[PDB]
Every structure is written in C-alpha cells, then in structure tokens.
Design a protein around this ligand. Structure first.
Ligand code: HEC
Ligand code: HEC
Ligand code: HEC
Ligand code: HEC
Ligand code: HEC
Ligand code: HEC
Ligand code: HEC
Ligand code: HEC
Ligand code: HEC
Ligand code: HEC
Ligand code: CA
Ligand code: CA
Ligand code: CA
Ligand code: CA
Lengths: 441, 441
C-alpha cells in the first residue's frame, strides 16, 4: 500500500513533483574532511574519519549513501561495516519495507541486504499519507512514516496526532534531521530524547545506559558521535520559540503560472528565494540579513576551531600516556573528560545550519565543551609527568586530509580502490535486480 | 554656565524632574561578591576584591562612590587609593569642574580632593545643554558633557555633532556605560576604542601599549580589568544593529495626567513598563519575553561559573609554581594566558545586561576565555612537574565572600571600621563646605 515510486504522483501533482525533482540542481558535494582535517583525528577509528561531505539535495540521498566510503564495499548481503539502519533516512522504500516486513524485520541484518530493495529517491511517501483520498484532492495529509520518529515525538510530550498543523510541519523534517543512535543488537534507529533534547539531557542519557558509538583509536576513549541535530537545535533557537517552522523558510508557499498557491518542494537555501521567505516577516533587506547570518557563521567557526585544536591535542596526549604505559584505571577519568568534551563539540556543530537556527546555543555548547577539554589536558599533563614526561606532546603533520588519514593508519589507496569497484559493478546489479522485481522503473 | 543643581530645573520641567527623581525608588544594593566569592580570587590585589555591588538607581551614584570600600577612607585631600577620575561618571558637578578648571585641572589629584565639590546627583547637565534657550522651551538639546566621551565617539567614526537624533540618544548613555581605563600621569578617563570595540580589538590595544590595571597577588599576572561595556556590547547585539536605542527600552515616551507625552526619566528595568517599551515593537506577551531573557541569563551564568572555576584554579596553581621557585621567564607565558583568559571573561560579564543586549556575544567571549584558561592550566601542570609536583593543587575554602577575603589576606573587620568612620564623619564635612560655597542645597 505504500507507494515508493515517486513518478506515480507526477500527473496528479505536477507543481509539487516538478519542484521536488529540482533538488537535483543542488548537486555540489563538498568534502568536509578536506576543509577540516582535524575531524580525521577526532573521528579516528570510526567511518567518519574515512569520508564526510556536506549535505546536498534530497535527490542525491540514495546515491550518496551508496557512494560514501563509510558504507564500504560489501561482498554479499551479510557483509560490510554498516547495518540496515543506514537506509532509514534516505528513501520511501524504507516506509515500504517497514510496512511489509515490520520494523524488526526491516532493521535486521546489514546495509548490503537493502541494496536491491532501497532504490527510489527520498520522496512523497516519506512525508505524506499518499493512501488518503484527500491527498489526491491536493491536501497534504502529513504523516510520520517512521515509527521510531513517532515514538520520539511522544517522548518529548508532542504526539504528532495531537499536534496542530504548524508543529506537524517541522515534525516531518524531524523524522530524519535529528541526532540518533543504533539501539540493541539489531541496531534500530532511536532518538536519545527520553530526558530531553538539550546536550546535557542527552549526555546524561548516554552515560546512564553506558552507550558508546566507537573507541577512538588514538586515545582509546569510548566516544559518542553527534549527527545533524536540526530538530533539537531549531527548537532551542528564537525562531523555533516563535514556531517559525522548517517550512516557513525552506518550503515557502509560491504561485504557479496560473496564479495558484502551492508549497515549493525544491528544499534548499532559503536565501535563494528571500522575497518569499525572510521577507514575509522582516523589513531588513537581503544583504543585511545575509551579513548577520555570515557573522554568526564566522563566530561559530572561529570558536569551533579552537575547541577542535584542544581535542586533537587531548587525543594525541592520551596516545602518549598509553605509549608510556598508563593503565586503564589511570586513563579512565581522562577518557571520561574527552568523551564529554567531544560530545559537546560534535552536537554544537554537527548541524551545518546552527549559526542560523540557534547561534547562541551552538556558542554555549562549544563553551561547555572547552571546559571538559581543559580538564582532560590538565589531568593528562599530570599523568604524563608521573611517567617522567614533562614536555609538550608533539602532533604529527595533519595539515591536509590525506596526511591526517595517513597519520591514523588508514590505507586510503586500498579503501578507495575497493569502493570504486563496488560503485562500478554492484550498484548497476542492484538497480537491474530492483527493476526485475518491479521496485524501480 | 553648567548648572549642576538639578532642583533649579524642577519648576520649568516638572514631568522630567519628578520621574528623574524617582530613581531613588530603585534602592536595593545587592552584594555581587557575596553572590560569587570566586570574584574575590580573580580580583586579588585590586579594590574590586573588597567590595562590588550590582548597580542601582542613578539617584544613588554619588552616595555609592562615597560609600564603597573601593574608595577607602582617605585622611586628607591627598590620601586614599583612588584618583579624581572616579567621580567622572557620578555627577553633573564633573561637567561644572571641567568647564571651570579644564579637563586636565579636573583629573589632577586624588578622589578625596573632589569630595567637597562633587555633591549633586547624576542629573540634567550630564545629558542636556541646559544653557541653551531651546532647553527652557522644552527641547532636549542633548549634549556630550564629557570631552573624553566625545573623543571616543569620533574614534569609532561617529562624531556626536554629525550623528542623527537616534544615534545621539545612545551616545549620551555611552558617556558612562562603557569600558574605560586611566590614561597617563593624571589618570584621565579614556575609552580603549582606537582599534574598535570588540574584545579582540581592546585586547590587542592594551597589549600594544603594555598596559595593566593591577598585578594579581596570587599569580603575579599583570591583569586587565573590564567595566560595564553596555555601549560596546549593545552595538554588537541585534537590537543595536537595528538601531533600537538605549532610550527605546529604558526611557519610553509616556503621558502625564493631563495626557501630555514626555520622556520618562525614571531609568530602570524596561520590563517595569512593558506596555510602553517592548510592546511597541513586539507582539509576544510580557511573561513570554521575560522567560526568554531569564533563560539567556541562566545560560550565561552557568558558563561564566565554569570559566571562573578554571581561573580560580589557574591563579592558585600559579601561586604553587611561584612557591616552588618558578622563574620570571618560566611564569611569563602562563601569565600571558591568564591575563588574556580573564580579560575575555571580565569583558563578557562585566555588563549585567549582556544576556539581554548581546547574549550571543557574551557567550562567544566566554568560550574564547576558556581556550586561554585551558592553555594556562596545561602549561602550569607541566611547569609544576618540572619542580617535582605531580598532584592536583588543593585550593583554600572559598565557599563564602568572607572566607575568600580571609584567604587572600584582607583584614575586612578593619577595612570596614575605617570606612564606617570615614562615612560618619568626613561626608557631612564635605556637604557642609559645599553648601557654604553655594554648590549644594
Ligand atoms: C535518523 C536519520 C539518519 C540516519 C539513521 C542516518 N542518516 Fe545519513 N543523513 C541524515 C540527514 C538529516 C543528512 C543531511 C544533513 C547532514 O549531513 O548534516 C544525512 C546525510 C548523509 C550523507 C551525506 C553527507 C555525508 O556525510 O557525506 C551520507 C553519505 C549519509 N547520511 C550516510 C549515512 C550512513 C552511512 C548512515 C548509517 C551510519 C546514516 N546516514 C544514517 C539522516 C540520517
Ligand atoms: C521532505 C518531506 C516531504 C516530501 C518528501 C514531500 N512533501 Fe509534499 N509537503 C510537505 C510539507 C511539509 C507540505 C506543506 C504542508 C502544509 O502546508 O501544512 C507539503 C505539501 C504538499 C501538498 C499539498 C499542496 C501544497 O502544495 O501545499 C501536496 C499535494 C504535496 N505536498 C505533494 C507531494 C508530492 C507529489 C511529493 C513527491 C514528489 C511530495 N509531496 C513529497 C513535505 C513533503
Ligand atoms: C527521509 C529523511 C529526510 C526527510 C524527512 C527530510 N530530510 Fe532533508 N535531507 C535528508 C538527507 C539524507 C539529506 C542529505 C542528502 C545528500 O547529501 O545526499 C538532506 C538534505 C537537506 C538539506 C540540504 C540541502 C542542500 O542542497 O544542501 C536541507 C536544507 C534539508 N534537507 C531540509 C529539510 C527540510 C526543511 C525537511 C522538512 C520539510 C527535510 N529536510 C526532511 C533527509 C531528510
Ligand atoms: C527562520 C528561518 C529557518 C528555519 C525556521 C529553518 N531554517 Fe534551516 N536554514 C535556514 C537558513 C537561512 C540556512 C542556511 C544558512 C546560511 O546560508 O548560512 C539553513 C540551513 C539549514 C541546513 C543546512 C543545509 C545547508 O547546507 O545549508 C539544514 C539541514 C536545514 N537548514 C534544515 C532545517 C530544518 C530541518 C528545520 C526545522 C527543524 C529548519 N531548517 C528550519 C533557515 C531556516
Ligand atoms: C514566519 C516569520 C519569519 C520568517 C519567515 C523569518 N523570520 Fe526571523 N524572526 C521572526 C521572529 C518572530 C523573530 C524573533 C524576534 C521577534 O519577536 O520579532 C525573528 C528573529 C530573527 C533574528 C534575531 C534572532 C537571531 O536568531 O539572531 C534574525 C537575525 C532573523 N530573525 C533572521 C531571519 C532570516 C535570515 C530569515 C530568512 C532565512 C528569517 N529570519 C525568516 C520571524 C521570521
Ligand atoms: C566611564 C564612566 C565610569 C567611570 C570612569 C567610573 N565608573 Fe563607577 N559606574 C559606572 C557605571 C555605568 C556604573 C553602573 C553599571 C555597573 O556597575 O555595572 C557604575 C557603578 C559604580 C558603583 C556601584 C556599583 C559597584 O561597583 O558597587 C560604584 C561604587 C562605582 N561605580 C565606583 C567607581 C570607582 C571607585 C571609580 C574609580 C575607579 C569609578 N566608579 C569610575 C561608570 C563609571
Ligand atoms: C542619563 C541622561 C539624562 C538625564 C540625567 C537627564 N536627561 Fe532629560 N532627556 C534625556 C534623553 C535621552 C531625552 C530624549 C531626547 C529625545 O527624545 O531625542 C531627554 C528628554 C528631555 C526633555 C525634552 C522633552 C521630553 O520629555 O522628551 C527635557 C525638557 C528634559 N529631558 C529635561 C531634563 C531634566 C529637567 C533633567 C534633570 C532633572 C534631565 N532631563 C536629566 C536624557 C537625560
Ligand atoms: C553620568 C554617567 C551616566 C550616564 C550619562 C548614564 N548612566 Fe546609567 N548608571 C550610571 C551609574 C554610576 C549607575 C550605578 C548607580 C549606582 O549603583 O549607584 C548607573 C545605573 C544605571 C542603571 C541600573 C538602574 C538600576 O536600578 O539598577 C541603568 C538601567 C542605567 N544606568 C541606564 C542608563 C541609560 C539607559 C543611560 C542613557 C539615558 C545611562 N544610564 C546614562 C552612570 C551613568
Ligand atoms: C532592546 C531593549 C534594550 C536596549 C536597546 C537597551 N537595554 Fe539595557 N536592558 C534591557 C533589559 C530588559 C534589561 C534587564 C534584563 C533583565 O531584567 O534580566 C537591561 C539591562 C541593562 C543594564 C543592567 C541594569 C541592571 O539592573 O542590572 C544596564 C546598565 C543597561 N541595561 C543599560 C543600557 C544601555 C547604556 C543601553 C544603550 C547602550 C541599553 N541598556 C540598551 C533592555 C534594553
Ligand atoms: C524599537 C523597537 C524594539 C523594541 C522597543 C524592542 N525590540 Fe526586541 N527586537 C526588535 C528588532 C528590530 C529585532 C530583530 C528581529 C527582527 O527583525 O524583528 C528584535 C529582536 C529581539 C529578540 C531576538 C534576539 C534574541 O535575543 O534572540 C528578542 C529576544 C527581543 N527582541 C526581546 C525584546 C525585549 C525583551 C524588549 C523589551 C525589553 C524588546 N526586544 C524591545 C525591535 C525592538
Ligand atoms: Ca549543503
Ligand atoms: Ca549519534
Ligand atoms: Ca540593579
Ligand atoms: Ca577597564
């Protein structure tokens, strides 16, 4: 009953379909590791040290999860580093499978298993109850197609079905644009929102279940990874406090050539249509508003670099303490500090929109990260001294992405060669197979 | 021609006179050192470690400068810790003396010397050209009565006489509500704005002229003291960027009983008259806006305390290094870091309005302070280890103002008794001479 094949809806909804399809124009894929090699050190031991780009259009979600080095080059349906859950926020086929196989059945196994099943571009079924008679009549019928997201919204005291129109608008974005972790042996997507959506709430939450994402290979710290917390941070910011929704800025109401109103489905930079976005509410002109947002982006970027420099030193200083023979008991309180410092930093800046959505909250977060980075490095200086080291720990050359990846032991030549062979030969097999099974066009 | 006796104007300007006089109702004097005993440590060796209160009504400026422990108990016109310049932002008799004796004449000598001269409350001649025939007709004729403030406004490319009416309104407050230092032999008020008003600009400015306000007596760091930077920080925040003036919030247009509109001169908390302040521009209700401002206040306070705890440790750790025989050369880079860390912290939170005027900027500044505090403490830990110390440095009990003051070697019982006697006996003498000279009554 869930229709994952988006083009089904084109004749009935040409304004929404044509604009939805146009996210393919947002095609630039910017390498964030090249731009910030410190990230390779911070994420040492984790797939994000291999490959991390800025987001681009929705049209590319499927392509990009296939192509990222993070997903590797599985040789069969039970192989590869990552689980089925990596599909969850990329395609309406996820909705299709959850309905067919149930949530547990969908999450079981490896990402590689979903390859010939998850094939349509993030689309209509992700956000709309397309099976409602009202939808054909041109009403939105917004829904949460993801039960893990429905459960999260209830956990914050905001059940979707009791929510008004405007809260529901941001909630559909909130199915994917959130911080999450993989829960249980089968790695189900969960939002860590049980105690609240603030960095302090989530930190306490993860510590109480003793969860870690990975162990940093330099410091041996049990780490937490933050991912794109737009919902949580937008909530904290002044626009969210005034229930200015994701849609007010990213999906403005515009007019077709016949003067009819519709929701613009080309989801991108709100500044690209200032006249229909900020200008609905603000008297300031485009240049003046761009200048403010740019200033905040710079303030955040300057402070973020300072925190990351502290963390790079902390990881290498912990590596030096290990190399001088520090025991697990000696390392533990240091590693607790590093875990908390990096959690705070990563949640502060994992969203590329933080300087717009809640710049004051990103700044505050970075400040609390810096407090724990200070504690870690002071403990480490004292620990190193007990092992007879009283000099500054020198860092290897991390001036480019390539040097940093080399420095942490990654064989990037082999990694990329394996991935490129996977892209060359497996993806077409997946698509050929999906077409044979009627899942794709 | 400056008229420092404010009551002169009462019959011509009864609406402004009566509301100006009403700041006397804002009478609560809150002890900031009691609320945060860490301050006593950070300002060790400076008058601020003795006595520091939150501000109250303008009506109390002359009495508070007289009554603070900071000015002490001078025995004659050439005694006491502080110079004439401490009167500068308290009273229209400053304008009177500047015009009579010239600026250089005014600044010469000790605070004690101006006692029998600076006797009228902060008032009309501080902000108005009262000599103008237009003033008796009811036109404001705003003026800068302080030449150093006029110089500072020119330095930021905003000469007062070329400014529009609305720029001029906030400049009048920016005669006093600024960061300043004492320049040269005679200790003249100067605002450090030559290179701009950002924390980074002022930090570089003071470093280039190798200025310090005092040497912290625990760490022997040459320190910089920040004071109430409202003008600078208001300029950095979104309200300033939008030319919302100090007056828009703090001196709203109100109607008298006969329904005549005038500027309310009872300068206080804008939330006391929300209907004529925020509500002129905002649709949100009073409780909602209060909740937002309180939330930023707590955010800043939380982070401020983290930074302060780091600085308290740094000052004591530096004391331990010194006791362990650290050389001047060994201490120097640490002292640079402490000096910078505390400057950034002090400028961030020296203004009690920062959480309202520019919360993102106060937060940003505190993060940059934390970066330097961390550097200081890491270098300290290494230095201490070279002297055979590898344990954490224990801190004295500083859980109260009294304990903190005892710990830095203040004899508060004696300091307070000398002040009480100064207050009971010298101030009536000053007032007697002023009245005899027709300066007071
Ligand atoms: C609960 C939602 C969610 C899940 C689970 C999720 N993602 Fe994403 N992903 C997003 C969102 C939202 C973006 C765009 C925002 C951003 O990248 O900052 C994104 C972007 C991406 C991108 C493009 C940017 C980049 O990093 O190169 C890739 C590739 C990606 N995800 C792969 C994965 C992989 C691999 C996993 C499993 C570890 C995963 N995703 C799990 C929501 C999710
Ligand atoms: C990323 C989530 C998402 C995607 C995917 C999505 N929509 Fe929408 N859609 C929305 C939101 C949000 C609205 C605005 C609802 C409102 O006004 O309250 C909307 C509005 C609509 C409406 C109501 C008419 C209008 O324009 O206001 C229709 C019909 C529609 N979309 C069709 C489609 C079609 C066809 C597709 C597949 C090409 C699609 N949607 C994919 C989120 C989405
Ligand atoms: C089904 C999960 C999902 C849904 C729901 C979702 N997003 Fe996304 N979004 C993604 C992923 C994944 C990417 C990154 C795509 C890539 O890089 O290939 C992305 C990218 C973006 C970007 C970056 C676009 C660009 O060109 O750089 C923006 C902005 C965005 N989404 C906004 C929204 C808004 C607003 C909503 C709510 C109407 C929403 N998203 C709903 C998953 C989702
Ligand atoms: C008040 C207007 C506004 C609101 C509401 C809003 N956004 Fe944004 N968002 C922006 C602007 C503007 C940018 C780009 C900032 C820039 O140009 O530097 C941005 C950036 C982003 C990005 C980073 C993509 C990129 O690479 O630029 C994502 C993802 C995103 N928004 C998603 C969301 C989500 C999801 C919501 C709702 C939870 C939301 N936005 C609500 C205005 C808004
Ligand atoms: C649906 C109405 C609406 C939209 C659209 C809108 N804004 Fe706002 N904006 C507000 C409201 C409400 C406030 C809070 C201040 C107030 O009470 O007026 C605000 C506050 C702000 C502030 C001050 C707080 C902060 O975050 O620094 C900035 C800057 C700003 N907006 C920029 C933008 C930009 C840029 C856009 C376009 C990407 C935009 N706004 C679009 C309504 C809107
Ligand atoms: C450039 C103007 C200016 C200068 C010069 C100045 N002050 Fe002030 N003073 C202010 C302002 C504005 C306030 C209220 C704001 C605040 O305290 O944060 C204030 C408040 C005070 C208070 C009441 C609050 C407190 O700290 O207990 C005292 C006492 C005081 N000043 C004493 C002094 C002393 C002593 C000097 C000489 C070292 C001095 N002032 C120099 C502007 C100035
Ligand atoms: C802290 C600075 C300051 C103080 C002290 C001060 N004024 Fe004012 N005054 C202002 C400002 C600002 C305005 C508004 C000017 C405008 O509207 O542009 C104003 C306006 C006025 C006006 C014009 C009419 C009106 O109500 O707007 C008169 C007359 C006046 N004040 C009289 C006085 C009197 C009399 C005193 C002494 C009892 C005094 N002021 C003290 C700053 C001050
Ligand atoms: C002549 C110097 C001077 C001028 C001009 C001046 N201030 Fe003040 N202000 C002070 C001092 C000193 C205090 C602290 C008084 C005390 O605590 O005894 C103070 C206190 C205040 C307070 C705290 C009131 C309270 O009850 O806590 C506010 C608000 C304030 N000033 C605002 C303004 C505004 C707005 C203007 C411009 C109209 C400004 N002032 C003009 C020196 C000045
Ligand atoms: C957009 C409104 C607005 C503007 C503009 C404004 N203020 Fe404020 N200011 C406030 C509010 C509201 C508070 C009290 C915050 C609170 O209650 O927590 C405050 C606090 C203060 C305080 C601290 C007083 C105290 O009681 O602790 C001072 C001093 C002050 N303002 C002076 C100024 C000066 C000088 C200017 C111009 C450079 C200015 N303000 C501009 C609204 C404003
Ligand atoms: C002269 C008109 C005016 C006055 C009076 C005014 N504001 Fe604002 N306020 C603005 C403007 C303009 C913005 C920028 C957002 C926008 O474009 O609307 C803003 C933004 C804000 C913001 C969002 C920035 C932030 O800090 O997140 C808050 C909060 C706010 N105002 C609170 C208040 C409070 C509280 C008062 C009363 C003490 C107040 N303003 C009085 C015009 C005004
Ligand atoms: Ca992007
Ligand atoms: Ca996570
Ligand atoms: Ca006060
Ligand atoms: Ca100063």
């Amino acid at each position: 009953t869930v229709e994952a094949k988006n083009e089904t809806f084109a004749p009935q909804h040409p304004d929404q379909y044509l604009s939805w399809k146009a996210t393919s124009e947002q095609s630039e894929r910017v390498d964030a590791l090249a731009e910030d090699p410190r990230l390779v050190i911070l994420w040492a031991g984790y797939p994000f040290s291999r490959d991390y780009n800025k987001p681009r259009g929705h049209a590319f979600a499927v392509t990009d999860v296939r192509e990222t080095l993070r997903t590797g080059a599985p040789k069969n349906a039970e192989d590869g580093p990552l689980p089925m859950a990596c599909w969850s926020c990329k395609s309406p086929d996820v909705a299709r499978l959850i309905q067919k196989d149930g949530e547990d059945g969908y999450f079981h196994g490896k990402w590689a298993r979903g390859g010939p099943e998850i094939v349509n571009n993030l689309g209509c079924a992700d956000c709309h109850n397309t099976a409602s008679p009202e939808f054909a009549k041109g009403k939105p019928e917004l829904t949460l197609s993801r039960p893990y997201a429905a459960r999260a919204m209830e956990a914050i005291g905001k059940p979707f079905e009791k929510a008004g129109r405007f809260d529901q608008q941001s909630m559909v974005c909130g199915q994917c644009h959130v911080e999450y972790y993989f829960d249980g042996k089968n790695k189900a997507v969960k939002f860590p929102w049980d105690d609240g959506m603030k960095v302090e709430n989530m930190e306490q939450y993860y510590d109480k279940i003793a969860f870690s994402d990975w162990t940093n290979s330099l410091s041996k710290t049990p780490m937490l990874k933050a991912e794109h917390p737009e919902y949580e941070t937008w909530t904290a910011g002044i626009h969210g406090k005034n229930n200015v929704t994701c849609i007010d800025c990213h999906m403005p109401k515009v007019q077709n050539a016949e003067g009819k109103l519709y929701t613009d489905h080309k989801i991108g930079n709100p500044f690209d249509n200032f006249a229909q976005t900020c200008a609905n509410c603000h008297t300031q002109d485009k240049a003046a508003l761009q200048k403010v947002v740019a200033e905040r982006k710079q303030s955040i970027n300057d402070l973020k670099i300072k925190v990351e420099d502290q963390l790079v030193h902390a990881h290498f200083e912990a590596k030096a303490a290990l190399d001088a023979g520090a025991t697990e008991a000696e390392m533990k309180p240091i590693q607790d500090d590093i875990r908390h410092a990096q959690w705070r930093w990563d949640l502060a800046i994992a969203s590329h929109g933080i300087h717009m959505h809640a710049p004051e909250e990103g700044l505050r977060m970075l400040g609390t990260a810096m407090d724990k980075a200070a504690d870690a490095r002071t403990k480490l200086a004292r620990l190193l001294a007990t092992k007879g080291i009283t000099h500054e720990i020198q860092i290897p050359d991390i001036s480019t992405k390539e040097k940093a990846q080399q420095a942490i032991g990654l064989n990037m030549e082999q990694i990329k060669a394996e991935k490129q062979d996977f892209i060359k030969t497996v993806i077409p097999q997946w698509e050929e197979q999906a077409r044979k099974n009627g899942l794709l066009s």
